[PDB]
Amino acid sequence: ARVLVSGLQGLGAEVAKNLVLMGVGSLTLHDPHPTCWSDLAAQFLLSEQDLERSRAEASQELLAQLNRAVQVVVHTGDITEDLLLDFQVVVLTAAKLEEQLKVGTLCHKHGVCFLAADTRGLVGQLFCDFGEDFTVQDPTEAEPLTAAIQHISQGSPGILTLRKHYFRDGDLVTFLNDCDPRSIEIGTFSRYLAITEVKRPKTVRHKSLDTALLQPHVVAQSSQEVHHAHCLHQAFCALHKFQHLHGRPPQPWDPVDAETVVGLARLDEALVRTVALSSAGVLSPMVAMLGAVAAQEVLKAISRKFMPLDQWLYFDALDCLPEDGELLPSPEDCALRGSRYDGQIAVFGAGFQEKLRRQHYLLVGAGAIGCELLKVFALVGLGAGNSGGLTVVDMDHIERSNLSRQFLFRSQDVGRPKAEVAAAAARGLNPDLQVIPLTYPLDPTTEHIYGDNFFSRVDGVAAALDSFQARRYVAARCTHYLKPLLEAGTSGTWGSATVFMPHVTEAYRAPASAAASEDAPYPVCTVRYFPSTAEHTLQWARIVGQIIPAIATTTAAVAGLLGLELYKVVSGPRPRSAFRHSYLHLAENYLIRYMPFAPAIQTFHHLKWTSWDRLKVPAGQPERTLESLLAHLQEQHGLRVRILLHGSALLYAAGWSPEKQAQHLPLRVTELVQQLTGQAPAPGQRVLVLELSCEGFPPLHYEL
Amino acid sequence: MASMRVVKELEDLQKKPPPYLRNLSSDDANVLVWHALLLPDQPPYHLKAFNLRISFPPEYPFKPPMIKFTTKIYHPNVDENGQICLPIISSENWKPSTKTSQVLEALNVLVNRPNIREPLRMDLADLLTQNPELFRKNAEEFTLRFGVDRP
Amino acid sequence: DEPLSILVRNNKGRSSTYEVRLTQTVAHLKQQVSGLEGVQDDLFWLTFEGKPLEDQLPLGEYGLKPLSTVFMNLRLRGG
Ligand SMILES: Nc1ncnc2c1ncn2[C@@H]1O[C@H](COP(=O)(O)O)[C@@H](O)[C@H]1O
């Protein structure tokens, strides 16, 4: 197919990158605007050198190198009612509501798919028009259900069999034998020798932009998200009217323009005031998220696979700015300084940039989500200096199949560790950033590498892993060291983004049942020799590798959500009312962004503790004996001791014998551990962790 | 919490030991490996006991323990290496709300008399099904040749 | 306390019908859904009108209505 994209503000750049990655047949990109400093804060294809140049020509080569098999082309001139008819779909980003109306009316009068995507500040707006009659083939996104059969017969209402899904009633099914579908008791042949169902296409009617603007129809999962979307739409209309009337965009954080914008609209006056004040720049996370959504809509408007979006979509993230009980950014602070961050500084300020320049972060897994996270980090400026940095850790090599999901990987870059090349690409994004690659898995066998000194510098961890065991282990390490965790997970079209902040949210609760399934031993007698019950007979020889091909739209969305979370994670202490977990299903237009739960407390005989808490007990000057330790525990707290063990070895028992107990009571804890386990104590380790149970549970931190 | 529950259950098991278990012992180094000696009552398995292991997983509640034997028992439900199949510990039957005592009692029931339903050793299953007299005559000789010293 | 019928939508696109009373915990409905769909209770959660649903609270707290929709959300790995 051939797709036209108009306006490479950075949202258009994200859309074009997604389309080229997915494999769009031909892409024509049109942008005459010259590149300025205020455009580098979100556009990852430009640079400092490509300044005072047209965005289209500058980004053409960078987009072409991504696939080299899509033939990206640049158009110079103007869009008339001659080039519109040659493209299957036209995407427009950041127009002026005049070109929007003209192109939309022309597209509706000629029957071509029309998309409008806009990102002003933190708020994003999307609009689709697929025409007056669009037919979609398979609005399921899942394999059609199947069932087995044994035998049938003949009857006027019909007779069906079922050998052991639910087929409901009245739908269409297939198999008489290899014939047309028959509606169903199956809707002249009395004999008996699997069954599969089929789906129906759906028809959808859309309106033109001129008609749709009069009365919108927004996609909302509840009823409290509709008035909010209406207020956002009114604010966007007021902003467009202001831009047309005055001829300039409102100044960043300017209090004089906000009054005019508010008076023009007149409703949520505070909301429109706040969006007007902050509508001055483009940020990498919001751009990435809206670009992922728009690219998915464009792709589903070509294959006609999933259900088109409704008229309007509005995305609102107004919780990344300082809270009400804080200091708002000032116009002097949010002033352009000729550096490649003016987009962020236009809404946040130079103080936030200074804060973000120093943080040090760890990234586990340089893969699909990892590359997008690296790009978002590079464009925002985590580190990029001498007082900060970044670390990337991964263990896998690069295979040929990684090229189809290779945002930062090249064909000549096969056969070398992923962490090194990912760090090299991130350095290429800006040389100021310093990234350290480590090719060692983070599992309970290389713990000596990642000790206390290693986590003494890390200020946060971002995990992008393809397992539950590794995710639970990383969460356990992070909660041991009391560090924020940023987790993301994608599968097909489903995606989730979550943040775990110590002492204000709940700890990561891994599903134990799921993690047990992975690395399961050979089933000795379930089905090995006699039985063959289901299709899973492949286990006899040794779903084979559990391969899930992720699409580039989900990874971009989850990366953008993670960046949005980071924006307020590195913004100091927050009251837990300003944190969100997000779940999204793009194919069904499902998006939820909710407030997480407070940590759950547990109470024993007299002990009130959460999942973050721990027991801290020091030692004496030479050392303290086990009897002294138990006495101190029973004195400071009411907790008695029944069993006290260290890992897989136990040091104490509630009842063994007077002799067995008196053998161990007058001994040093370190001496006892060395006596049980012949391995020497770790010199780098400072704190020993002990597990204890009362008579009849937070760990014991033995500060050596 | 797979190293806490095992040691919390071993004490309870030793409090009221079953009549068919003897020398229930641990290593005190790794708390996730047990030891025992059981003397089955049904003949010709009443002569000598047999050693075994109750090896535990790193996540015991959500995985079945491995109950590999150690002696040279001849029985049409155990492999020549020492492994044994039990329906209680299976992917379609294992549950996180089951104790080790029920597993061991099911083991005792299984070793009392072969179930001849899903035999792991196909050679002895046919001999038991057709001519039990020869199988009984040879099992005692095999146990005498290889078996424990005494219960 | 009269029984009320609601709709539960799963990840495969279907929307089954359940009969529950607004006096029992969400854990009971999760067990019902686990039995009807054959997935573990710890492998997913439920969502209604955006906000998730806590296991230990009665369904009357959220304020459901007849023939309402409750979505399932799996705990997904990969990436
Ligand atoms: N615990 C871990 N430590 C380091 N790398 C990991 C860990 N778990 C997963 N990974 C890596 O994360 C990447 C996930 O793959 P993908 O989901 O395709 O990006 C792979 O490169 C894995 O090797």
Side-chain angles (χ1 to χ4, degrees), chain A residues 512 516 525 645 647-650 696, chain B residues 3-4 7-8 28-31 62 85:
Chain A
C525 274
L645 80 162
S648 176
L650 74 160
Chain B
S3 294
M4 189 90 264
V7 86
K8 207 185 272 223
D28 219 324
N30 41 358
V31 81
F62 305 93
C85 293

Side-chain angles (χ1 to χ4, degrees), chain A residues 364-365 367-368 393 395 441-442 464-466 470, chain C residues 78-79:
Chain A
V364 197
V393 53
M395 85 278 279
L442 198 145
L465 310 186
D466 55 358

